[PDB]
mmCIF file of C-alpha atoms in Angstrom:
data_model
loop_
_atom_site.group_PDB
_atom_site.id
_atom_site.type_symbol
_atom_site.label_atom_id
_atom_site.label_comp_id
_atom_site.label_asym_id
_atom_site.label_seq_id
_atom_site.Cartn_x
_atom_site.Cartn_y
_atom_site.Cartn_z
ATOM 1 C CA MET A 1 -19.970 -7.600 -13.913
ATOM 2 C CA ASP A 2 -16.403 -7.003 -12.371
ATOM 3 C CA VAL A 3 -14.114 -9.706 -12.021
ATOM 4 C CA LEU A 4 -13.968 -10.794 -8.205
ATOM 5 C CA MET A 5 -10.460 -12.134 -6.994
ATOM 6 C CA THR A 6 -10.739 -14.575 -4.074
ATOM 7 C CA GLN A 7 -7.777 -15.681 -1.931
ATOM 8 C CA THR A 8 -7.631 -18.316 0.081
ATOM 9 C CA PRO A 9 -6.254 -19.327 3.048
ATOM 10 C CA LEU A 10 -6.518 -15.471 4.880
ATOM 11 C CA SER A 11 -3.485 -16.461 6.700
ATOM 12 C CA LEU A 12 -0.874 -19.072 5.865
ATOM 13 C CA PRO A 13 1.369 -19.858 9.248
ATOM 14 C CA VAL A 14 4.398 -21.712 8.207
ATOM 15 C CA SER A 15 7.775 -22.647 9.874
ATOM 16 C CA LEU A 16 11.275 -21.436 7.467
ATOM 17 C CA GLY A 17 12.073 -24.213 5.179
ATOM 18 C CA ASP A 18 8.082 -25.562 4.837
ATOM 19 C CA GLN A 19 6.386 -25.485 1.851
ATOM 20 C CA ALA A 20 3.428 -23.081 0.883
ATOM 21 C CA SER A 21 0.618 -22.684 -1.522
ATOM 22 C CA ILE A 22 -1.837 -20.429 -1.749
ATOM 23 C CA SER A 23 -4.707 -20.413 -3.854
ATOM 24 C CA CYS A 24 -6.276 -17.307 -6.373
ATOM 25 C CA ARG A 25 -10.162 -17.927 -7.718
ATOM 26 C CA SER A 26 -11.780 -15.663 -10.197
ATOM 27 C CA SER A 27 -15.705 -14.762 -10.672
ATOM 28 C CA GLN A 28 -14.692 -15.756 -13.998
ATOM 29 C CA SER A 29 -12.477 -16.149 -16.678
ATOM 30 C CA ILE A 30 -9.711 -13.565 -16.984
ATOM 31 C CA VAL A 31 -8.553 -14.304 -20.725
ATOM 32 C CA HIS A 32 -7.440 -11.068 -22.214
ATOM 33 C CA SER A 33 -8.670 -10.219 -25.522
ATOM 34 C CA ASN A 34 -5.342 -10.961 -27.145
ATOM 35 C CA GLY A 35 -5.120 -14.426 -25.534
ATOM 36 C CA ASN A 36 -2.920 -13.756 -22.845
ATOM 37 C CA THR A 37 -3.914 -14.339 -19.073
ATOM 38 C CA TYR A 38 -2.750 -11.477 -17.206
ATOM 39 C CA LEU A 39 -2.918 -12.832 -13.464
ATOM 40 C CA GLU A 40 -0.023 -11.843 -11.066
ATOM 41 C CA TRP A 41 1.289 -12.205 -7.867
ATOM 42 C CA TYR A 42 2.640 -9.293 -5.925
ATOM 43 C CA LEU A 43 4.471 -9.317 -2.128
ATOM 44 C CA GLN A 44 4.277 -6.609 0.227
ATOM 45 C CA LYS A 45 6.096 -6.039 3.544
ATOM 46 C CA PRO A 46 4.741 -3.782 6.075
ATOM 47 C CA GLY A 47 4.916 -0.243 5.953
ATOM 48 C CA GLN A 48 6.316 -0.726 2.336
ATOM 49 C CA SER A 49 4.842 -1.261 -1.175
ATOM 50 C CA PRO A 50 4.460 -4.214 -3.319
ATOM 51 C CA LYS A 51 6.429 -5.950 -5.493
ATOM 52 C CA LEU A 52 5.934 -8.122 -8.558
ATOM 53 C CA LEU A 53 6.757 -11.742 -8.030
ATOM 54 C CA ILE A 54 4.804 -13.544 -10.973
ATOM 55 C CA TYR A 55 3.273 -12.083 -14.078
ATOM 56 C CA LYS A 56 1.195 -13.997 -16.944
ATOM 57 C CA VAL A 57 0.086 -16.673 -14.400
ATOM 58 C CA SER A 58 3.632 -18.558 -14.701
ATOM 59 C CA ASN A 59 6.453 -16.019 -15.543
ATOM 60 C CA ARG A 60 9.064 -15.349 -12.616
ATOM 61 C CA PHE A 61 9.876 -11.510 -12.677
ATOM 62 C CA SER A 62 13.302 -10.742 -12.779
ATOM 63 C CA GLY A 63 14.934 -11.263 -9.513
ATOM 64 C CA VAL A 64 12.473 -13.655 -8.288
ATOM 65 C CA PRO A 65 14.364 -16.996 -6.903
ATOM 66 C CA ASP A 66 13.231 -19.963 -8.183
ATOM 67 C CA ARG A 67 11.528 -21.333 -4.816
ATOM 68 C CA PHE A 68 9.037 -19.159 -6.378
ATOM 69 C CA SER A 69 6.447 -20.667 -8.780
ATOM 70 C CA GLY A 70 2.987 -19.905 -10.055
ATOM 71 C CA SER A 71 0.459 -21.947 -12.055
ATOM 72 C CA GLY A 72 -3.610 -22.353 -13.032
ATOM 73 C CA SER A 73 -5.899 -21.461 -15.669
ATOM 74 C CA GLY A 74 -9.697 -20.692 -15.998
ATOM 75 C CA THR A 75 -10.713 -19.624 -12.350
ATOM 76 C CA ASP A 76 -8.022 -21.369 -10.274
ATOM 77 C CA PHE A 77 -4.435 -20.243 -9.728
ATOM 78 C CA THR A 78 -2.005 -20.853 -7.391
ATOM 79 C CA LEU A 79 1.142 -19.537 -5.974
ATOM 80 C CA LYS A 80 3.719 -21.775 -4.415
ATOM 81 C CA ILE A 81 7.153 -21.414 -2.238
ATOM 82 C CA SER A 82 9.463 -24.965 -2.218
ATOM 83 C CA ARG A 83 11.079 -23.806 0.976
ATOM 84 C CA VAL A 84 10.134 -20.726 2.597
ATOM 85 C CA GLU A 85 12.939 -18.187 3.961
ATOM 86 C CA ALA A 86 12.559 -15.058 6.348
ATOM 87 C CA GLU A 87 12.449 -12.689 3.061
ATOM 88 C CA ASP A 88 9.081 -14.257 1.878
ATOM 89 C CA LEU A 89 7.011 -13.698 4.957
ATOM 90 C CA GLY A 90 4.574 -10.962 3.905
ATOM 91 C CA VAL A 91 0.920 -10.571 2.299
ATOM 92 C CA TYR A 92 0.587 -11.810 -0.768
ATOM 93 C CA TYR A 93 -1.956 -10.293 -3.628
ATOM 94 C CA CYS A 94 -3.221 -11.747 -6.774
ATOM 95 C CA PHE A 95 -4.173 -9.596 -9.482
ATOM 96 C CA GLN A 96 -6.220 -9.681 -12.750
ATOM 97 C CA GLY A 97 -5.336 -7.236 -15.739
ATOM 98 C CA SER A 98 -7.740 -8.626 -18.320
ATOM 99 C CA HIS A 99 -10.632 -7.094 -17.985
ATOM 100 C CA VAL A 100 -11.381 -3.773 -16.688
ATOM 101 C CA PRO A 101 -11.730 -2.709 -13.991
ATOM 102 C CA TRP A 102 -8.475 -4.642 -13.428
ATOM 103 C CA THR A 103 -9.236 -5.996 -9.591
ATOM 104 C CA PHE A 104 -6.711 -7.318 -6.697
ATOM 105 C CA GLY A 105 -7.528 -10.439 -4.641
ATOM 106 C CA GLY A 106 -7.577 -9.939 -1.151
ATOM 107 C CA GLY A 107 -4.722 -10.986 0.060
ATOM 108 C CA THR A 108 -2.670 -13.642 2.200
ATOM 109 C CA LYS A 109 -0.621 -12.919 5.071
ATOM 110 C CA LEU A 110 2.489 -15.735 5.230
ATOM 111 C CA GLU A 111 3.403 -15.427 8.700
ATOM 112 C CA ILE A 112 5.710 -17.653 10.856
ATOM 113 C CA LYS A 113 4.952 -20.036 13.364
ATOM 114 C CA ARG A 114 5.884 -18.214 16.578
ATOM 115 C CA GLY A 115 4.080 -20.410 19.242
ATOM 116 C CA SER A 116 3.064 -19.151 22.822
ATOM 117 C CA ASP A 117 6.243 -17.372 23.497
ATOM 118 C CA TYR A 118 9.817 -15.748 21.391
ATOM 119 C CA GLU A 119 11.359 -19.583 21.464
ATOM 120 C CA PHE A 120 11.119 -19.340 17.438
ATOM 121 C CA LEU A 121 13.369 -16.633 17.031
ATOM 122 C CA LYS A 122 16.222 -18.880 18.513
ATOM 123 C CA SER A 123 16.295 -20.957 15.513
ATOM 124 C CA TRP A 124 17.007 -17.989 13.567
ATOM 125 C CA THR A 125 20.008 -16.820 11.956
ATOM 126 C CA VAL A 126 21.299 -13.210 13.164
ATOM 127 C CA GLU A 127 20.905 -12.315 9.726
ATOM 128 C CA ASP A 128 17.099 -12.698 9.469
ATOM 129 C CA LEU A 129 16.745 -11.621 13.169
ATOM 130 C CA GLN A 130 18.143 -8.167 11.901
ATOM 131 C CA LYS A 131 16.353 -7.816 8.713
ATOM 132 C CA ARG A 132 13.002 -8.712 11.031
ATOM 133 C CA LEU A 133 14.164 -5.859 13.400
ATOM 134 C CA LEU A 134 14.536 -3.540 10.504
ATOM 135 C CA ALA A 135 11.108 -4.385 8.638
ATOM 136 C CA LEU A 136 9.460 -2.670 12.032
ATOM 137 C CA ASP A 137 10.395 1.109 11.126
ATOM 138 C CA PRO A 138 8.763 1.327 7.887
ATOM 139 C CA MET A 139 5.567 0.328 9.914
ATOM 140 C CA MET A 140 6.192 2.896 12.865
ATOM 141 C CA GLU A 141 6.779 5.629 10.936
ATOM 142 C CA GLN A 142 3.632 4.672 8.769
ATOM 143 C CA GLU A 143 1.409 4.692 12.040
ATOM 144 C CA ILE A 144 3.112 7.684 13.306
ATOM 145 C CA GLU A 145 2.005 9.269 9.945
ATOM 146 C CA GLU A 146 -1.346 8.105 10.382
ATOM 147 C CA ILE A 147 -1.623 9.872 13.835
ATOM 148 C CA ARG A 148 -0.323 13.163 12.379
ATOM 149 C CA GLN A 149 -2.982 12.580 9.443
ATOM 150 C CA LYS A 150 -5.701 12.323 11.806
ATOM 151 C CA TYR A 151 -4.754 15.031 13.941
ATOM 152 C CA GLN A 152 -4.643 17.374 11.212
ATOM 153 C CA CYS A 153 -8.486 16.250 10.478
ATOM 154 C CA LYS A 154 -9.386 17.067 14.055
ATOM 155 C CA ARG A 155 -7.809 20.882 13.618
ATOM 156 C CA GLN A 156 -9.132 21.655 10.718
ATOM 157 C CA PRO A 157 -12.807 22.351 11.689
ATOM 158 C CA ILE A 158 -11.567 24.056 14.661
ATOM 159 C CA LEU A 159 -9.659 26.052 11.920
ATOM 160 C CA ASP A 160 -12.348 26.923 9.787
ATOM 161 C CA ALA A 161 -14.703 27.981 12.791
ATOM 162 C CA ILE A 162 -11.847 30.427 13.896
ATOM 163 C CA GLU A 163 -11.630 31.795 10.028
ATOM 164 C CA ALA A 164 -15.230 32.332 9.932
ATOM 165 C CA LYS A 165 -15.721 34.367 12.969
ATOM 166 C CA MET B 1 20.237 2.480 -13.607
ATOM 167 C CA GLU B 2 19.008 3.491 -10.396
ATOM 168 C CA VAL B 3 15.019 3.160 -10.544
ATOM 169 C CA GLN B 4 13.451 5.750 -8.211
ATOM 170 C CA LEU B 5 9.288 6.905 -7.997
ATOM 171 C CA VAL B 6 9.004 9.656 -5.520
ATOM 172 C CA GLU B 7 4.963 10.547 -4.884
ATOM 173 C CA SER B 8 4.147 14.359 -3.461
ATOM 174 C CA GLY B 9 0.835 16.094 -3.029
ATOM 175 C CA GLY B 10 -0.877 13.880 -0.670
ATOM 176 C CA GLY B 11 -2.554 15.182 2.689
ATOM 177 C CA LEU B 12 -5.956 16.312 4.095
ATOM 178 C CA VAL B 13 -8.951 17.392 2.120
ATOM 179 C CA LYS B 14 -12.636 17.738 3.062
ATOM 180 C CA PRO B 15 -15.354 15.559 0.889
ATOM 181 C CA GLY B 16 -15.904 17.235 -2.187
ATOM 182 C CA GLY B 17 -12.400 19.088 -1.822
ATOM 183 C CA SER B 18 -9.468 17.991 -4.487
ATOM 184 C CA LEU B 19 -5.814 17.635 -4.201
ATOM 185 C CA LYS B 20 -3.357 16.916 -7.233
ATOM 186 C CA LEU B 21 -0.822 13.858 -6.499
ATOM 187 C CA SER B 22 2.596 14.075 -8.477
ATOM 188 C CA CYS B 23 5.021 11.276 -8.814
ATOM 189 C CA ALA B 24 8.899 12.492 -9.622
ATOM 190 C CA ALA B 25 10.581 9.141 -12.181
ATOM 191 C CA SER B 26 14.366 9.027 -12.748
ATOM 192 C CA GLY B 27 16.605 5.852 -13.367
ATOM 193 C CA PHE B 28 14.667 4.741 -16.679
ATOM 194 C CA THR B 29 12.771 6.238 -19.816
ATOM 195 C CA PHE B 30 9.920 7.120 -18.617
ATOM 196 C CA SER B 31 8.496 7.920 -21.791
ATOM 197 C CA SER B 32 8.814 4.403 -23.198
ATOM 198 C CA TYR B 33 5.970 2.846 -20.504
ATOM 199 C CA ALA B 34 2.790 3.168 -18.979
ATOM 200 C CA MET B 35 2.278 4.408 -15.849
ATOM 201 C CA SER B 36 -0.537 3.715 -13.074
ATOM 202 C CA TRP B 37 -1.406 4.954 -9.705
ATOM 203 C CA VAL B 38 -2.932 2.014 -7.721
ATOM 204 C CA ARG B 39 -4.208 2.622 -3.674
ATOM 205 C CA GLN B 40 -4.075 0.923 -0.307
ATOM 206 C CA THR B 41 -7.326 1.329 1.601
ATOM 207 C CA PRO B 42 -6.468 1.707 5.696
ATOM 208 C CA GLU B 43 -8.109 -1.709 5.319
ATOM 209 C CA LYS B 44 -4.974 -2.574 3.334
ATOM 210 C CA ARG B 45 -7.642 -3.423 0.564
ATOM 211 C CA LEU B 46 -5.398 -2.876 -3.066
ATOM 212 C CA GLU B 47 -7.355 -0.922 -5.714
ATOM 213 C CA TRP B 48 -6.429 0.341 -9.459
ATOM 214 C CA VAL B 49 -6.902 3.852 -9.609
ATOM 215 C CA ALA B 50 -6.076 4.824 -13.216
ATOM 216 C CA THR B 51 -3.355 4.047 -16.189
ATOM 217 C CA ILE B 52 -2.301 6.232 -18.931
ATOM 218 C CA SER B 53 -0.135 5.056 -22.036
ATOM 219 C CA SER B 54 3.436 5.562 -22.381
ATOM 220 C CA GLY B 55 2.742 8.513 -25.031
ATOM 221 C CA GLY B 56 -0.392 10.020 -23.090
ATOM 222 C CA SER B 57 -3.235 9.245 -25.659
ATOM 223 C CA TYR B 58 -5.026 6.629 -23.840
ATOM 224 C CA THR B 59 -6.407 6.724 -20.415
ATOM 225 C CA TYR B 60 -7.889 3.863 -18.295
ATOM 226 C CA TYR B 61 -10.336 4.375 -15.101
ATOM 227 C CA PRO B 62 -12.430 2.026 -13.187
ATOM 228 C CA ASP B 63 -15.944 3.529 -12.752
ATOM 229 C CA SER B 64 -15.260 4.669 -8.705
ATOM 230 C CA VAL B 65 -13.199 7.409 -9.850
ATOM 231 C CA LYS B 66 -14.268 7.939 -13.562
ATOM 232 C CA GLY B 67 -15.362 11.580 -14.254
ATOM 233 C CA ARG B 68 -13.522 12.558 -10.798
ATOM 234 C CA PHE B 69 -9.818 11.699 -11.502
ATOM 235 C CA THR B 70 -7.501 12.452 -14.441
ATOM 236 C CA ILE B 71 -4.516 11.004 -15.019
ATOM 237 C CA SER B 72 -1.744 12.721 -17.024
ATOM 238 C CA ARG B 73 1.901 12.944 -17.947
ATOM 239 C CA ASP B 74 4.883 15.075 -18.700
ATOM 240 C CA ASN B 75 7.297 12.825 -20.283
ATOM 241 C CA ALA B 76 9.667 15.864 -20.687
ATOM 242 C CA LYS B 77 9.675 16.361 -17.072
ATOM 243 C CA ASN B 78 9.654 12.988 -16.403
ATOM 244 C CA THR B 79 6.704 13.032 -13.973
ATOM 245 C CA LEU B 80 3.118 11.642 -13.436
ATOM 246 C CA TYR B 81 0.039 13.460 -11.912
ATOM 247 C CA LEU B 82 -3.155 12.401 -10.889
ATOM 248 C CA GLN B 83 -5.726 15.505 -10.141
ATOM 249 C CA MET B 84 -8.355 14.266 -7.976
ATOM 250 C CA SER B 85 -11.398 16.037 -7.477
ATOM 251 C CA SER B 86 -15.316 15.426 -5.902
ATOM 252 C CA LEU B 87 -13.063 13.479 -3.071
ATOM 253 C CA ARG B 88 -15.330 11.193 -1.169
ATOM 254 C CA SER B 89 -14.439 9.304 2.333
ATOM 255 C CA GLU B 90 -13.625 5.875 0.703
ATOM 256 C CA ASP B 91 -10.778 7.833 -1.299
ATOM 257 C CA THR B 92 -8.777 7.911 1.879
ATOM 258 C CA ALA B 93 -5.739 5.729 0.857
ATOM 259 C CA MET B 94 -2.228 5.400 -0.030
ATOM 260 C CA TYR B 95 -1.599 6.000 -3.166
ATOM 261 C CA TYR B 96 1.605 4.777 -5.062
ATOM 262 C CA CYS B 97 2.951 5.590 -8.376
ATOM 263 C CA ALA B 98 3.695 2.478 -10.748
ATOM 264 C CA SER B 99 5.522 1.511 -14.101
ATOM 265 C CA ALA B 100 4.228 -1.079 -16.375
ATOM 266 C CA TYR B 101 6.102 -3.040 -19.151
ATOM 267 C CA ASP B 102 3.179 -2.890 -22.027
ATOM 268 C CA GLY B 103 2.236 -6.084 -23.078
ATOM 269 C CA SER B 104 3.595 -8.129 -20.088
ATOM 270 C CA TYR B 105 3.006 -6.869 -16.615
ATOM 271 C CA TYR B 106 0.957 -4.195 -15.176
ATOM 272 C CA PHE B 107 3.133 -2.962 -11.799
ATOM 273 C CA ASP B 108 6.564 -2.889 -12.091
ATOM 274 C CA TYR B 109 8.320 -0.529 -9.566
ATOM 275 C CA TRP B 110 6.522 0.903 -7.258
ATOM 276 C CA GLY B 111 7.572 4.316 -5.212
ATOM 277 C CA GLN B 112 6.764 4.629 -1.613
ATOM 278 C CA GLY B 113 3.397 6.337 -1.737
ATOM 279 C CA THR B 114 1.782 9.543 -0.521
ATOM 280 C CA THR B 115 -1.169 9.438 2.065
ATOM 281 C CA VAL B 116 -4.568 10.931 1.154
ATOM 282 C CA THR B 117 -6.658 11.460 4.258
ATOM 283 C CA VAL B 118 -10.210 12.680 3.432
ATOM 284 C CA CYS B 119 -11.602 14.619 6.600
ATOM 285 C CA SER B 120 -15.131 13.461 8.277
ATOM 286 C CA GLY B 121 -18.454 15.625 7.280
ATOM 287 C CA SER B 122 -18.908 16.940 10.408
ATOM 288 C CA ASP B 123 -17.397 18.347 13.560
ATOM 289 C CA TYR B 124 -18.135 21.805 12.546
ATOM 290 C CA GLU B 125 -21.769 21.731 13.230
ATOM 291 C CA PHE B 126 -21.144 21.960 17.142
ATOM 292 C CA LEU B 127 -18.069 24.382 16.613
ATOM 293 C CA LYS B 128 -19.532 27.188 14.399
ATOM 294 C CA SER B 129 -21.202 28.855 17.897
ATOM 295 C CA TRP B 130 -18.221 28.575 20.411
ATOM 296 C CA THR B 131 -16.092 31.455 21.299
ATOM 297 C CA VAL B 132 -12.866 32.070 19.902
ATOM 298 C CA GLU B 133 -11.375 31.653 23.286
ATOM 299 C CA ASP B 134 -12.620 27.913 23.559
ATOM 300 C CA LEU B 135 -11.870 27.123 19.993
ATOM 301 C CA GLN B 136 -8.291 28.408 20.226
ATOM 302 C CA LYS B 137 -8.390 26.609 23.586
ATOM 303 C CA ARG B 138 -9.206 23.587 21.596
ATOM 304 C CA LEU B 139 -6.347 23.771 18.890
ATOM 305 C CA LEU B 140 -3.920 24.159 21.942
ATOM 306 C CA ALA B 141 -5.003 21.181 23.879
ATOM 307 C CA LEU B 142 -4.744 19.051 20.505
ATOM 308 C CA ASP B 143 -1.148 18.980 20.460
ATOM 309 C CA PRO B 144 -0.135 17.360 23.853
ATOM 310 C CA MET B 145 -2.435 14.237 22.552
ATOM 311 C CA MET B 146 -1.073 13.932 19.571
ATOM 312 C CA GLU B 147 2.583 13.775 20.635
ATOM 313 C CA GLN B 148 1.489 11.196 23.460
ATOM 314 C CA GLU B 149 0.051 9.343 20.785
ATOM 315 C CA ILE B 150 3.273 9.084 18.979
ATOM 316 C CA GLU B 151 5.210 8.269 22.193
ATOM 317 C CA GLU B 152 2.892 5.416 22.794
ATOM 318 C CA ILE B 153 3.393 4.016 19.177
ATOM 319 C CA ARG B 154 7.253 4.240 20.310
ATOM 320 C CA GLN B 155 6.710 2.539 22.979
ATOM 321 C CA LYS B 156 4.662 -0.187 21.633
ATOM 322 C CA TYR B 157 7.421 -0.767 19.093
ATOM 323 C CA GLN B 158 9.882 -0.743 21.787
ATOM 324 C CA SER B 159 8.109 -3.735 23.488
ATOM 325 C CA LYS B 160 8.123 -5.233 19.721
ATOM 326 C CA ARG B 161 11.617 -4.866 19.200
ATOM 327 C CA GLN B 162 13.011 -5.969 22.678
ATOM 328 C CA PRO B 163 12.349 -9.974 21.521
ATOM 329 C CA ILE B 164 14.227 -9.539 18.387
ATOM 330 C CA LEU B 165 17.018 -7.854 19.691
ATOM 331 C CA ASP B 166 17.227 -10.318 22.970
ATOM 332 C CA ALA B 167 17.430 -13.045 20.357
ATOM 333 C CA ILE B 168 20.633 -11.551 18.850
ATOM 334 C CA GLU B 169 22.243 -11.047 22.298
ATOM 335 C CA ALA B 170 21.731 -14.850 23.025
ATOM 336 C CA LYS B 171 24.079 -15.993 20.230
#
């Protein structure tokens, strides 16, 4: 049977500076035949591809700050952020590469505590505010391309019908 | 020293159709590392699609695409390929090209991806009896609607950007 990767929680609201802990559970043991445990954590920003943070349960990928740490064994694995910064917000995925088919977790969204208005943005530095603004452009371009794909699919049956006459 | 993976070849296709994806690698010794394809469905679910060894002698697939997708590489051209045949609706996703470090970790560098869209298996049924006039009129009518949906997306993001711009202005 395929290994199921289940993440918890689905969403984790935090403020900047808070500690963050997210869990990843496998439906069975994920010890590779060579003895290693190929559990990896990835972080994805909207409109952008995922990036590797932790490999083999606990090894920090090159460039990943010290505040990130991974641990666990058996079927329980945890990723912790000691002090959340604005660049850490996004969707975290765990992944097992021990048994084929290799499978991803469902994802955990680390998001900011925004309140009922926009007063949370006022504690942010201009640099963090600018990064939040610029992170919208890839998400917009993706949605625009998705609409372009939808309308190509809409106009294809018409083109086939015209060509068949 | 400037790693870059550029996917191409995506687009629209009908169920049962085919597409060939390409991934141009540069900035590293492509022939020294295993390569993989990983896709992200419209529901943001990530699924591993295929993996090929550094020299191409070993390939790995999940059963969902085994027999339909073929991963290959040209180490002289520093290019990764994914030939997709017998495409089904569940194959609609953004396909990422990604490098590995054999023995350590699976997905080192990711490209920005190429989108594959599998069209519906219908809509042509009620269209094969229309007149050429009505068909071309439907074609012409579609473009204003698409540009309107795009413009409405831009307005949505203008509203998303404004509170962030306001916070920068209030410093």
